[PDB]
């Protein structure tokens, strides 16, 4: 079996709502189509064993993001463009996936900050592991 990461493209910042690190009902507000996202795998980190989240949890954006750009601490995985406001990645081996929104395109919209998510993720109860990780990163529009 394999793991997969589903990224739901959304536009606009939360409206007084709290940050949720789990599945939530989709707002369904106008999404940004033709959005570019790319996955980068963090080396030395394997979500295959328990020790993996411990080391990974000690990760500092300072190491993956210091000069406003990624370092050698990341490995190129694949670049795909979200279409229809929804993107999905498959054939994912246990590790750490990092999503970066490319500046290219997005003329009426400004590039939002990137987000990081480990895969696979443990179940809400901590029992077993989930084969699919859901993410709802929002974009920041221009003006």
């Amino acid at each position: 079996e394999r793991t997969s990461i589903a990224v739901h493209a959304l536009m606009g910042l939360p409206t007084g709502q709290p940050a949720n690190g789990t599945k939530l009902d989709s707002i369904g507000l106008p999404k940004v189509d033709g959005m570019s996202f790319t996955l980068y795998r963090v080396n030395e980190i394997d979500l295959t064993t328990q020790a993996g989240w411990d080391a990974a949890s000690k990760i500092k954006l300072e190491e993956l993001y210091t000069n406003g750009h990624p370092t050698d601490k990341v490995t190129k995985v694949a670049t795909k463009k979200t279409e229809g406001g929804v993107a999905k990645f498959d054939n994912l081996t246990p590790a750490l996936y990092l999503v970066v929104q490319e500046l290219n395109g997005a003329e009426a919209v400004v590039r939002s900050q990137p987000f990081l998510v480990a895969a696979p993720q443990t179940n809400p109860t901590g029992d077993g592991w989930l084969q699919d990780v859901h993410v709802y990163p929002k974009h920041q529009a221009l003006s």
């Binding site: 940050a19 987000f115 990081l116």
Partner: peptide, 10 residues
């Protein structure tokens, strides 16, 4: 929460 990384953006 324990498990997770940084996906505050919903």
């Amino acid at each position: 929460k324990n498990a997770g990384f940084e996906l505050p953006l919903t």
